[PDB]
Amino acid sequence: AAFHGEVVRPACTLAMEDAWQIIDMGETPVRDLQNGFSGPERKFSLRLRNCEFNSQGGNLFSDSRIRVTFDGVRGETPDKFNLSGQAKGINLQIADVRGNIARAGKVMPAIPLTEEALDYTLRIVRNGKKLEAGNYFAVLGFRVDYE
């Protein structure tokens, strides 16, 4: 149509495989942790829809047209997030597809994508305190700032 009303780019809607937007982390990985390693990796994918996320030559994230940040309570170190619940001695770590580790409240670096999807990997890590198994969890903010 040559003549029509205003049409604007909508903001992205976030979609996950799980209806609750939850990632199952698994039982506290005590045996891994005591061996000195992190627990097993858990992948999660955040699909960003309705915002024409991909363009001929790139996409909103890689081109820095949106900026993404994981929000939460920082754990033992800048590279770590605190967890709630009965468990003790544990924190969470999140990494992008090139192994950049998220820090609470700090923008993720723009990288080319490998999908309308952003893919992250989480793992449970030690936090310096005495390990006590129990249940745990966290709610993390995934903040998308639009340029």
């Binding site: 903001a11 209806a19 937007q21 990632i23 993390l140 639009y146």
Partner: protein, 216 residues
């Protein structure tokens, strides 16, 4: 789950309020939508001079709703000859699962909210971004924005394709200001910016020595 209908909002200062549409795109579960405004430094404001209502609302699965932006009488203290910047924030609260050992993700959308006084009101499709000036300096360009509006620059290259797709760190110029950006030299610079509608036009520039302005 909860989404917003635009990537920036322009508040026309000739009116007292406007609405933004929102949606719970999850068709299975209810989500809460929290709304608030921040100032130009991304610090939260609450009593004015722009407010968002309702601050919290439940969205049934698949439900569509709105958030209203209103001004208070203190809006008249803002300058009337240039834009003022706010940020509009829409943060969801997902339904709590009491599932063991889970991480739950809650989206927050943060867009720019341009307060645009009546005295600088624009017509549909009006372009002021072609008034930008580029000045070659050591390592890049000093970009001048002489206009009353914020201008968000997203590309600068030697061709239209490089402007659209080349690596460039987004910069936003305040009304009547200037900022230097790191850049290679371009014989005929092309510059890309984001307009009121989320579109990304490209401008073609011609240079006389170090100074460049849009091709007439």
């Amino acid at each position: 789950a909860v989404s917003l209908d635009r990537t920036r909002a322009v508040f026309d200062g000739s009116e007292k309020s406007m609405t933004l549409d929102i949606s719970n795109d999850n068709k299975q579960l209810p989500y809460l939508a929290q709304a608030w405004i921040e100032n130009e430094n991304q610090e939260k404001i609450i009593t004015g001079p722009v407010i968002a209502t309702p601050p919290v609302q439940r969205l049934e699965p698949g439900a569509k709703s709105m958030v209203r932006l209103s001004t208070t009488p203190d809006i008249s203290k803002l300058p009337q000859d240039r834009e003022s910047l706010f940020y509009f924030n829409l943060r969801e609260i997902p339904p709590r699962s009491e599932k063991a050992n889970v991480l739950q993700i809650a989206l927050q959308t943060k867009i720019k909210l341009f307060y645009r006084p009546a005295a600088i009101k624009t017509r549909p499709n009006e372009v002021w971004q072609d008034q930008l000036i580029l000045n070659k300096v050591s390592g890049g360009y000093r970009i001048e924005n002489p206009t009353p509006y914020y201008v968000t620059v997203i590309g600068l290259g030697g061709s239209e394709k490089q402007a659209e797709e080349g690596e460039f760190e987004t910069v936003m110029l305040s009304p009547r200001s200037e900022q230097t950006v790191k850049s290679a030299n371009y014989n005929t610079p092309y510059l890309s910016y984001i307009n009121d509608y989320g579109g990304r036009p490209v401008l073609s520039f011609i240079c006389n020595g170090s100074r460049c302005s849009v091709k007439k």
